[PDB]
Write a protein that binds this ligand. Structure first.
Ligand SMILES: *[C@@H]1O[C@H](CO)[C@@H](O[C@@H]2O[C@H](CO)[C@@H](O[C@@H]3O[C@H](CO[C@@H]4O[C@H](CO[C@H]5O[C@H](CO)[C@@H](O)[C@H](O)[C@@H]5O)[C@@H](O)[C@H](O)[C@@H]4O)[C@@H](O)[C@H](O[C@H]4O[C@H](CO)[C@@H](O)[C@H](O)[C@@H]4O)[C@@H]3O)[C@H](O)[C@H]2NC(C)=O)[C@H](O)[C@H]1NC(C)=O
Ligand SMILES: *[C@@H]1O[C@H](CO)[C@@H](O[C@@H]2O[C@H](CO)[C@@H](O)[C@H](O)[C@H]2NC(C)=O)[C@H](O)[C@H]1NC(C)=O
Lengths: 184, 227, 128, 135, 184
């Protein structure tokens, strides 16, 4: 694994995490965003807050984090601390009383092409308008608005990974049934 | 001149804790795992949360941290901070409070021959769906799922630790003398299983984890006497 | 604030914020301790604890942080991050929650004669 | 992003930006800080604890003449996103909190424009003292 | 402060906090441990947890932290941050749901002879078997097991300062009376 040590020393010698990772500043950073819902922890009807456990899969290419595997003993992917690189600053725009942004800075998977996949965990506490007219037989539409807090579309573009949230690893709830889910 | 300092500078002057301890990228790191439960603090039915105190025992090999006692004055063990060595980054995946890691970053013990042992303690709050049908005369099946947060099954794999006789400890270990039973919950069973999945062609890299299943029985005396 | 930058560089060259200021062995540092009560938050009878919001008022002299104003564009005082200077380790001994320290470190006000005034906020839960 | 990399090197390393010092020519000058508040949602008003919980976006605007550049000498760049820990900040706090969280929750990037204006919009969750009139 | 400044700079020039503080690795570090009970915060019978406020006085000798006072203007004792030095890693083995080890890193008093005293505070939440048979007139024999988590007796030895816990600064409890106390 001395190849990986040499490679990581090479990639971060003159690297800047402040700067957006594309070759020309007039270009846009294309970020693919997908949400995986692990658990619907609780719905608070009084304060109108939905707390969930999620994984926020973010994919983007970093122009300066590329290498030839043949020059580094066949290494084609590595794991890097997320604090070290530039990241999109996704924020839950309708956060109720939780964290606004990602606080668990797990490692990113970096490919030799420069593609970065980062799947941080998060507990999202969102503000959901609760209609109690038909409580206990009520139906609640709860959204999670996500966006780059400080970057506008002309510098960083976000696109959905899928038309729907990923519910493949969703833990069953004893209080709610998810009829429909969708990302726009 | 303390020989521990000489050994420490011999093992760590040129050492990268960010790279796995493998000579080739395609090689796998085998991690021997034991989980010891010291206390079952509670099962909160309203939040569906199991609170436990454990210590995880993680053993592996790091060829870069290999030394002989004869060349270092007979030292057979070196304690060093866990931050200086590569770690498999084992986390409880099914936590409910956002706490994935261990409670206290204890020293790793580096033995001669490249063997690394880490015994961190942890307080875990895990998801346990409560089957209410026979409450308070109920039994529950609370899972503890452990997996590397970073590495896939080709990069890091798991095996269970073995006792002195060599029998595989495929269960939660409990020290009988030091164990105090929870006031409301008796631990009837605690098997462990290493699962491997998502190795299909479409799925791509394989994934693995270790699931322990605490089968716990409520002691219903309070509800019988009072309600 | 180039004059302030030069003054700060002069003051913190060779300064050790972990070493108590005593020009001679045996010199005691006199610390003046006062308290401003912003709010009496509560007195919990169940937990037997008083919760208050306060500003401490700590004053002491640090001879290393003295200068002549005339040589520094007439700067008679500075505001410095508290972690940059030696602090007296004044804590609430009878806290009930395990928290000994102040809520926010903020900034000290240092005068040209070495006088240091520090007024950190604190939310304290004391045993009553 | 060769041009923003060059611009950041010019602003912070070439000219030696010191974030500890205020953006003033003389110590006797004061920095004008403009403040606005946007209320995202009123979380609650707990009467027994007499606490107001709010989600607020505080808009801070000030001028830092050390952070000026000609957009045409740097590839027509007109705005920069920077981590807040690189620049001097006018540390504004909620004075009348009752839990000890004096500061903003998420320290987002500052926006620095070529004419020296620093825009900063940190969001925050605040728990403040609200005495309750029960009459 | 010039003398102590120079002394500290000398002491931590070539210092290592990783290795044990002995001239010879075959020697044992002798640590004197004394528990002082300031307050008995709570006895939770349901979860079987005892919450106490304690000071954990730890005394040992660091071989490499010695000096001659005459070479430093007569300085015979100093106070230094505890995070810079090797410490024993005392852990509450029967911790229930609190902190396993010391988390409040208060200053150590260092003598010129190398003697270190370190008296950190802690909130101990200890698991203890609670017998409710005679409640409300119940007696509870609770315990706090302390030890070096990663060091064995062959490399680090712990000895009690006294036969009994120090109750000299114990605040009176409105719910419990400590009949007996002892360390073994
Ligand atoms: C306490 O809680 C634990 C955890 O929930 C319980 O253990 C689990 O019990 C389940 C049964 O209730 C087990 O699931 C069955 O496993 C059988 C084992 O046979 C193997 O099947 C493999 C097939 O592929 C597996 O892996 C892929 C991974 O991608 C997965 O998608 C598949 O679904 C499957 O799990 C095969 O490769 C292997 O060689 C074995 O043959 C399996 O046969 C069962 O399948 C039957 O039932 C399902 C029902 O949906 C049906 O669709 C199938 O056609 C078939 O009839 C189950 O999958 C699970 O493995 C246990 N987990 C462990 C032990 O880790 C435990 O029982 C609880 N204790 C109590 C209640 O006392
Ligand atoms: C750590 O180093 C020792 C010493 O080099 C290794 O032990 C040797 O193993 C080889 C075979 O691989 C034998 O030929 C030698 O005789 C052994 N020792 C001596 C005296 O050289 C040991 O295998 C190494 N451990 C690891 C994990 O690589």
């Amino acid at each position: 694994s001395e190849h990986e040590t040499r490679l990581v020393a090479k990639l971060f010698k003159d690297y800047s995490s402040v700067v957006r990772p594309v070759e020309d500043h007039r270009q846009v950073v294309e970020v693919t965003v997908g949400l995986q819902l692990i658990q619907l922890i609780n719905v608070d009807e009084v304060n109108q807050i939905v707390t969930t456990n999620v994984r926020l899969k973010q994919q983007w290419v970093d122009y300066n984090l590329k290498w030839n595997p043949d020059d580094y003993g066949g290494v084609k992917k590595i794991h890097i601390p997320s604090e070290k690189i530039w990241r999109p600053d996704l924020v839950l725009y309708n956060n109720a009383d939780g964290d606004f942004a990602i606080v668990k800075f797990t490692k990113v998977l970096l490919q030799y092409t420069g593609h970065i996949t980062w799947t941080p965990p998060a507990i999202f506490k969102s503000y959901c308008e609760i209609i109690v007219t038909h409580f206990p037989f009520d139906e609640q539409n709860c959204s999670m608005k996500l966006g780059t807090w400080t970057y506008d579309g002309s510098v960083v573009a976000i696109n959905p990974e899928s038309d729907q949230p990923d519910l493949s690893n969703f833990m069953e709830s004893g209080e709610w049934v998810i009829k429909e889910s969708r990302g726009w | 001149k303390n020989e521990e300092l000489r050994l420490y500078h011999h093992l760590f002057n040129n050492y990268d804790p960010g790279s796995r301890p493998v000579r080739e990228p395609e090689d796998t790191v085998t991690i021997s795992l034991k989980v010891t439960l010291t206390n079952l603090i509670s099962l909160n039915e309203k939040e569906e949360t199991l609170t436990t105190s454990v210590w995880i025992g993680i053993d592996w090999q790091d060829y870069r941290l290999n030394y002989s006692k004869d060349d270092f004055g007979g030292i057979e063990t070196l304690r060093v901070p866990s931050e200086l060595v590569w770690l498999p980054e084992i986390v409880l995946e099914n936590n409910i409070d956002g706490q994935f890691g261990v409670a206290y970053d204890a020293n790793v013990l580096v033995y001669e021959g490249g063997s690394v042992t880490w015994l961190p303690p942890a307080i875990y709050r895990s998801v346990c769906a409560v089957e209410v049908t026979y409450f308070p005369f109920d039994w529950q099946n609370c899972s503890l799922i452990f997996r590397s947060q970073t590495y896939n099954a080709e990069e890091v794999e798991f095996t269970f630790a073995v006792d002195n006789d060599g029998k595989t400890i495929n269960k939660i270990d409990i020290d009988t003398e030091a164990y105090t039973e929870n006031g409301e919950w008796a631990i009837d069973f605690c098997p462990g299983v290493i699962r491997r999945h998502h190795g299909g062609a479409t799925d791509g890299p394989g994934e693995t984890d270790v699931i322990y299943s605490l089968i716990i029985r409520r002691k219903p005396l309070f509800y019988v006497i009072n309600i | 604030s180039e004059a302030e930058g030069r003054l700060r560089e002069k003051l913190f060259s060779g300064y050790d914020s972990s070493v108590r200021p005593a020009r001679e062995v045996g010199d005691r540092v006199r610390v003046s301790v006062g308290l401003i009560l912003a709010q009496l938050i509560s007195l919990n009878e169940k937990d037997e604890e008083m919760s208050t919001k306060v500003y401490l008022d700590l004053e002491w002299t640090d001879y290393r942080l003295s200068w002549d104003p005339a040589e520094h564009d007439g700067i008679d005082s500075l505001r410095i991050t508290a972690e940059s200077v030696w602090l007296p380790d004044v804590v609430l001994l009878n806290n009930n929650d395990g928290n000994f320290d102040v809520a926010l470190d903020i900034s000290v006000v240092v005068s040209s004669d070495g006088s240091v005034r520090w007024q950190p906020p604190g939310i304290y839960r004391s045993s009553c | 992003l060769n041009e923003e990399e060059r611009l950041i090197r010019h602003l912070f390393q070439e000219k030696g930006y010191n974030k500890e010092l205020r953006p003033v020519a003389h110590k006797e000058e004061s920095v004008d800080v403009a403040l606005a508040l946007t209320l995202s949602n009123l979380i609650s008003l707990k009467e027994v604890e007499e606490t107001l919980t709010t989600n607020v976006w505080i808009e801070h605007g000030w001028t830092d003449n050390r952070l000026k550049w000609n957009a045409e000498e740097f590839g027509n760049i007109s705005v920069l996103r920077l981590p807040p820990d690189m620049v001097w900040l006018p540390e504004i706090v909620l004075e009348n909190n009752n839990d000890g969280s004096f500061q903003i929750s998420y320290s987002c990037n500052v926006l620095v424009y070529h004419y020296g204006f620093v825009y900063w919009l940190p969001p925050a969750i605040f728990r403040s003292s609200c005495p309750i009139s029960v009459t």
